[PDB]
């Protein structure tokens, strides 16, 4: 009966930053994946366990849209199999994911003439995070036998670094929004399928 919220996922102007990545969940609705593939503006549609053109005729238990913003030259990290600050510390997909990653240049939407310090990524952690783990804790990361007492200094780091998305950035330094559509099948008591 109902039509899926993809129309808002790709039109909410306010997105969280990757360390605090948003999740929205799809249920009881018509999932028009194909009109996403008709989009003028998109800059990746690389998918895992699928080819995007055919998707419309398939049926699913749940879908998660996970969404955030990334510096373009590190958009490659988001998919499986590669270490890098995002995949190491902010947002890791499984050993065998199934779903699709959608991304687009956002400099016209997201940049500010000062750098937009509302955008943040974690760059220190005691160990790498597990698949779809999330961590908005911000207690000081130590770098020496110094107990940092929960306050910053030499060898005592605040965990989150900003991207600084200026208008004067090259193609790869620019902000790219990302949505990861994570799929699920199972025994399949589905409430999500395309038209």
């Amino acid at each position, epitope marked *: 009966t109902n039509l899926c919220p993809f129309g808002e996922v790709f039109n909410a102007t306010r997105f969280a930053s990757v360390y605090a990545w948003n999740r929205k969940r799809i249920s009881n609705c018509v999932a028009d994946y194909s009109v996403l593939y008709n989009s003028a503006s998109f800059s990746t549609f690389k998918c895992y366990g699928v080819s995007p053109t055919k998707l419309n005729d398939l049926c699913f238990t749940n879908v998660y849209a996970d969404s955030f913003v990334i510096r373009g030259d590190e958009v490659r990290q988001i998919a499986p199999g590669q270490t890098g600050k995002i995949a190491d510390y902010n947002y890791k997909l499984p050993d065998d994911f199934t779903g699709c990653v959608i991304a687009w240049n956002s400099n016209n939407l997201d940049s500010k003439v000062g750098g937009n310090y*509302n955008y943040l990524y974690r760059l220190f952690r005691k160990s790498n995070l597990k698949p779809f783990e999330r961590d908005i804790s911000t207690e000081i990361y130590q770098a020496g036998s110094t107990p940092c007492n929960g306050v910053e*200094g030499f060898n005592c780091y*605040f965990p989150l670094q900003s991207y*600084g998305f200026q208008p004067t950035n090259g193609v790869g330094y620019q902000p790219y929004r990302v949505v990861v559509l994570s799929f699920e099948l199972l025994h399949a008591p589905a409430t999500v399928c395309g038209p």
Partner: antibody
Amino acid sequence: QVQLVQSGAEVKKPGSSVKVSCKASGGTFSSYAISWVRQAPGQGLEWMGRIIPMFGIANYAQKFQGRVTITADKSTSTAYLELSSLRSEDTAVYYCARYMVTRDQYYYDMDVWGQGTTVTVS
Amino acid sequence: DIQMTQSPSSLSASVGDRVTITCRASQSISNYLNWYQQKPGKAPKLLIYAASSLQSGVPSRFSGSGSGTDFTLTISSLQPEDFATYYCQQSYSPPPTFGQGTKLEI
């Protein structure tokens, strides 16, 4: 760019608490720290405590821990210091100042300062 | 925790003069130190955010130096803009204690 503007002067009886505030303009607390500094009249500057409005986390120097609390409401771009139990020796000019706790692994480089609030007793 | 000291208390100078100031730290700092000035009865402003790295919009009148402790700040072609009191401040371990300050008379 971002300009802090700061509460007018506070005259209060000894021991009775005080409240003072800073609010941003041309922006907001975009994951900056803001932190509070005394200029006691003709003394060196002294540092009171960090707050990061983006996370509400705050911490204090040993000398003020317990005497003071600092707080903020990011949606209204406003941070507050309130101090109890005042004037042991104290009638300082109080400054808020920002520092960019997410911009680098370098800290306490206070690049913008409020106008300063006189806080004092009779 | 850390302690600061800064010398001298005051200096006389002239417009166009060259002048140098020092700060010293009681634990070593690996060049985690800053410098500020304030005019009499107005807000401090930051000049330097390491031993040497100058802050944006500040004129070329200033330079700084040091190595683990015993830092310095220098004025070249001194101005009425430099009548201010100057402070050092360590950033190496909290709380970020400021110096006692120094006075320049034009």
